[PDB]
Amino acid sequence: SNKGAIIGLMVGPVVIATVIVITLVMLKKK
């Protein structure tokens, strides 16, 4: 019920976005 927790977990997919974007990098060449 706080506007502080909503943003705390929001960055979740933002922190793990790395491992997700790297996949496209390897496929970019292969």
User: What is the number of structural domains in the chain?
Assistant: 1
The alpha carbon of 11 is separated from its chain's Cα centroid by a whole number of angstroms, namely: 7
Cα–Cα distance for residue pair 27/20, rounded to 1 Å? 12
Residue-range definition of the domain harbouring residue 19? 1-30
DSSP letters, 1-30, are --TTHHHHHHTHHHHTHHHHHHHHHHHHH-
10 Å CB burial of residue 17 (0-12, 13-18, 19+) is: exposed
Q: How was this structure determined?
A: NMR
Cα–Cα distance for residue pair 9/22, rounded to 1 Å? 22
The one-letter code for the residue type at 4 is G
Rounded to 5 degrees, what are φ and ψ at 11? -75, -5
Rounded to 5 degrees, what are φ and ψ at 4? -95, -30
The one-letter code for the residue type at 28 is K
Cα–Cα distance for residue pair 1/13, rounded to 1 Å? 21
